[PDB]
Amino acid sequence: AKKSMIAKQQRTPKFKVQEYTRCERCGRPHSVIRKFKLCRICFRELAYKGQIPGVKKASW
Amino acid sequence: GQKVNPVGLRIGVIRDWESKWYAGKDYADFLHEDLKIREYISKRLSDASVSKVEIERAANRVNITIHTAKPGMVIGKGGSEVEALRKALNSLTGKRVHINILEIKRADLDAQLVADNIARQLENRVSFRRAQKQQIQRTMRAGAQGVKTMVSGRLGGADIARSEYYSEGTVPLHTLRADIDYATSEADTTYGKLGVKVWIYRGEVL
Amino acid sequence: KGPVAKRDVLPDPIYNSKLVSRLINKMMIDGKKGKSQTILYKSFDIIKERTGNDAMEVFEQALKNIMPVLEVKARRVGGANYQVPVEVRPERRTTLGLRWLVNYARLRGEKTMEERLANEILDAANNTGAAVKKREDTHKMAEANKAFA
RNA sequence: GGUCCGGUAGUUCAGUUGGUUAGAAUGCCUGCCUGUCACGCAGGAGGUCGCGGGUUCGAGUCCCGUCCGGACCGCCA
RNA sequence: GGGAGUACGGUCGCAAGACUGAAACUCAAAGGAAUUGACGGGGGCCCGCACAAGCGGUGGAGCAUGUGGUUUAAUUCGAAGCAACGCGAAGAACCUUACCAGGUCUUGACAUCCUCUGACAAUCCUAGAGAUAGGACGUCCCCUUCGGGGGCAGAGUGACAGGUGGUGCAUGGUUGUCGUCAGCUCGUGUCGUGAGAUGUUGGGUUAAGUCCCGCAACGAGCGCAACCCUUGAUCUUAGUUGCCAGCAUUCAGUUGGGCACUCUAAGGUGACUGCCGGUGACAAACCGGAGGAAGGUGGGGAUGACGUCAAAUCAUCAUGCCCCUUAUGACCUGGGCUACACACGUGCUACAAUGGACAGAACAAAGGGCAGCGAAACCGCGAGGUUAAGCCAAUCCCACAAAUCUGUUCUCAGUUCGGAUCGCAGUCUGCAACUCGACUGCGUGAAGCUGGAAUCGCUAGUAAUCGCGGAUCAGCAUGCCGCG
């Protein structure tokens, strides 16, 4: 059961509290980064692919 | 425990992001519509085949460049079709868009095109042995320095899966100076799921 | 593998005696800096008061008193775990003796640290102190098991 | 049928005599050890004394009876 | 091959026993030699905080969190030695959230097709939780030679949609582990008959299958190294929001003036065994010097070979079956994942005078800040509130880094240590703080006075301490990530 409450996330809830954040490309509710509205799995995917113009594999 | 993605590692040092626009406070939605248009054009050009598409931003006007020689054939007959589809991109993006078609000469050494070739040969019932062993030498005589290609899944022996790969040439993955282009593709079969991974050593960079 | 070593807490190179070597550097092995270079340098003056001579001389005199010259380690042989006497390197000597002074200073227990330490420095300048006590117990253990080479 | 013994932790035996203290192995429990188990190492709980009655400031341990078993005797024509 | 050199009958022997020697039944192997790995309480070498040699810890107490057990209506599922157990969760009052009780719906929030109504919605009213009864304006576009199309929603509609429902021993795609260990292979050729061997062994060498020297081997590939990032010395360019050497000025090195210096960020220099002596055959290399900011892969990061563990994930993905669509699919209210007789793992706080308390004096990263950061002043002894300057940030703010140094008191106690748990009274956020937040003022003040058997991390900016930010996001950090 995923489509129903991704649709819940899409529609505005009855209170300003309830609008939790789900990742938009892949509907995981946990561990999204606000700067991309993306969660780690499908974030790392297109990160290795090349998207997200500014980010690189870091090292120091 | 498997290897890091080679282009994933090489981005930004020897490879460009294929999304060459700066944003700030609009990064999330710019990125989102970039994925949306990527998905749309890949879906609707899969038959014609295309490897990589770059996106560029100017005055809120998106502009695109799209690869592979077959969209070259989409220039002539599909020249009407190019406008027809880019109308859809205009509708999606809200603000109107520009496009460009760049021809990849020598398609035998593009990773994604090779992967799509292998995926199609697999899905139309050809044996992995013939397909892969023929494609490797095709690319080699096309003039790569080294190739390694790999398929996995229920390889005919449906009751159990396994892994297999062929290669002939020089292919350094640990060196951060090579130009190891990488791609992967998914092939759905009746007896299960088949995945493909192909990369080629083109040359070093200086 | 192989031997390795370092030097630190170095005083100045020239026109340096041991007394000012320590009066500007050295030892202090009690914890982080501060609460040392302090709780010390004052222990010495209280014993300038408590003895009518240079408070440094009693320090290394008590040090000489505490120094061992043999000790014993443990070796696995058959089912006995024989205690084997061995010697002490010139630096092992100093580190372990100093260690005994400091740990017993923080063990003995009186009103406060600097008087504790000073009382032990004099109880080791005289040959009746807790650290010296362990020194002779290690020694009698050692040459009671001298036979083992 | 008579005489003599005894009956205690879940099991086996001290105490049971010292009227004024309930103990020792095994078992069991927790932890550690070992990849796991077993050894092994730390720790810990237990019975409140066959049953009933009585003396005594006080009965496990004194005196009675009842149950339980065990030892011995049950012979002369 | 067992049955068995046993059974029976004989011949010997005093005896032990010896010689002769069946069968029934039962199995498809039992064996010889060689080959490759594994393993040995086998040998010869070598390595690693592996052990020694040191520091401080874990369990003994309180609490934070995770797990087992039990408990329930549910305590949602996944994870199970190293390599699960402050793990999926970079955040559970509702939401998340699946599970439980109750109340509810059916082509269904969600997607494409078919026919209509044409553009369709929102606000407010009683029951109200969904939702339904109906309302007050109350279903209102672009093109159309006007036929009708395009998109927009609404209704009906049958195909269909839904599966965080199972199966990681059907898979993809990912990830851990041995392991940053030094190995793992092939081309061609040789030897063997064949499993196979050589190269890949032997001398040293290093971290290395690193290199050199021999060698039926000659080469190549994946591994190692380097190429990458970052910190260490400096040259050129650039001096604003930085820096103020010399000057006038100031409490506001802010101004005036100037890139002197730092600093900032681009391009080079740089350390390459380069050079000298010795060792070593002269080779490879190793030892010691000098230059040198840096000498022998300077430091650290990124990089993780062929593969084993049917290692983990059906919670992103899809054959496979079943669940049906008047139910495992869906909407709402409340409860739970926080329960609590106990057990374990990982952490924070202590157990005190190298200390507590009070006052003064300091030194300073790397990051974040627009439904944001939020200055100053005033209010409250406080959590905070009022009105708010500046800042889209080398300008403003978050942001008064603590440890530390100095001085006063305390005088060894279950204490002025410890602060647990409690009742009272408040602040903040959020509709909402009972289950079930954090913070603060009171009152309270528990156990604990260095922790059995055992056991862990750490080779110098490390451990040990001390703080400071940051993802998650309204609030929720003793966790994690990062900084000094």
3-state SS of C18-84 is: HHHHHHHCCCCCCCCCCCCCCCCCCHHHHHHHHCCCCHHHHHHHHHHHHCCCCEEEECCCCCCCCEE
Query: Residues of A within the annotated binding site for Zn(2+)?
Result: 23, 26, 39, 42
A42 vs B: CB within 8 A? no
Q: Does B31 touch chain A (CB under 8 A)?
A: yes
Strands B180-189 and B61-66: unpaired
Q: Got the DSSP string for chain B?
A: --PPPHHHHHBTTTB--SB----SSSHHHHHHHHHHHHHHHHHHHTTT----EEEEEETTEEEEEE-SSHHHHHHHTTHHHHHHHHHHHHHHHSS--B--B---S-GGG-HHHHHHHHHHHHHTT--HHHHHHHHHHHHHHHT-SEEEEEEEE--S-TTS-EEEEEEEE---SS-TTS-EEEEEEEEEETTEEEEEEEEEE-----
Q: Resolution to 1 decimal, in Å? A: 3.4
Q: How far apart are the C-alpha atoms of C82 and B43, rounded to whole Å?
A: 80
Going by C-alpha positions, the residue among B200, B187, B107 that lies closest to residue B149 is: B200
- Which helix (H) or strand (E) covers residue A7, if one does? helix A3-10
The span from the CA of B89 to the CA of B96, in Å, is: 8
Nucleotide nearest to B187 (CA to C1'): E172
Q: Inter-chain contact A50–B9, Cβ cutoff 8 Å?
A: no
Listed residue (C25, C32, C28) closest to C40, CA to CA: C28
Find, among A40, A10, A12, A13, the residue nearest to A26 by Cα.
Answer: A40
Residue contact A50–B32, C-beta within 8 A: no
Q: CA–CA separation, B170 vs B23, rounded Å?
A: 40
- In sequence order, what are the residues at sequence separation of 6 or more whose Cβ sits closer than 8 angstroms to the Cβ of residue C20? C11
CB atoms B31 and A52 under 8 Å: yes
Please check whether residue B111 is in contact with residue B142, taking contact to mean a CB–CB distance below 8 angstroms: no
Please report residues of A whose CB lies closer than 8 A to that of B27.
Answer: 35-36
What is the rounded distance in angstroms from the CA atom of residue B168 to the CA atom of residue C71? Answer: 67
Contact indicator for C72, C83 with CB cutoff of 8 Å: yes
Q: How many Å apart are CA B151 and CA C54, to the nearest integer? A: 85
Q: For residue C123, give the DSSP letter.
A: H
Q: At what angle do helices C90-108 and C113-125 cross, to 10 degrees?
A: 130
Closest residue of chain A to B38, computed from CA coordinates:
A51
Dist CA B121 CA B187 (whole Å): 9
A38 neighbourhood in chain B, CB within 8 Å: 31
Identity of the residue in B7, B15, B34 whose CB atom sits nearest the CB atom of A51? B34
Dihedral over Cα of C145, C73, C71, C125: its sign: negative
CA distance linking residue B146 with residue B200, whole number of Å: 6
3-state secondary structure of C134: helix
Q: Which residue has the tokens 């070739």?
A: B117
Nearest-CA distance from A46 to chain B in Å? Answer: 9
Q: Which of B20, B27, B35 sits opposite A25 (nearest CB)?
A: B35
Query: Can you give the length of chain C in residues?
Result: 149
Q: Out of B5, B21, B38, whose CB is closest to A48?
A: B5
Residue type at C19?
Answer: L
| H or E element at residue A33 | strand A32-33
Which residues make Cβ contacts (< 8 Å) with residue A25, sequence separation at least 6? A38, A42, A46, B32, B35
What φ, ψ does residue A33 adopt, rounded to 5°?
A: -105, 125
Sequence-separated (6 or more) residues with CB below 8 Å from residue C52 = none
Token pair in block for residue B40: 């749309």
Class of residue B116 by CB neighbours under 10 A (exposed 0-12, middle 13-18, buried 19+)? buried
Strand pairing report for C83-86 and B146-153: unpaired
How buried is residue A34: exposed, middle or buried, by Cβ count under 10 Å (0-12/13-18/19+)? exposed
Query: Strand B146-153 to strand B162-169: parallel, antiparallel, or no bridges (unpaired)?
Result: antiparallel
Can you give the C-alpha Rg of chain C in angstroms?
18
Around Cβ B5, how many Cβ atoms within 10 Å? Answer: 18
Secondary structure (3-state) at A1? coil
B142 touches chain A (CB under 8 A): no
Does the CB of A35 have a partner CB in chain B at under 8 Å? Answer: yes
Q: Which residue in B53, B48, B42 sits closest to B20, CA to CA?
A: B53
User: A7-14: long-range contacts at Cβ-Cβ below 8 A with a sequence spacing of 24 or more?
Assistant: none
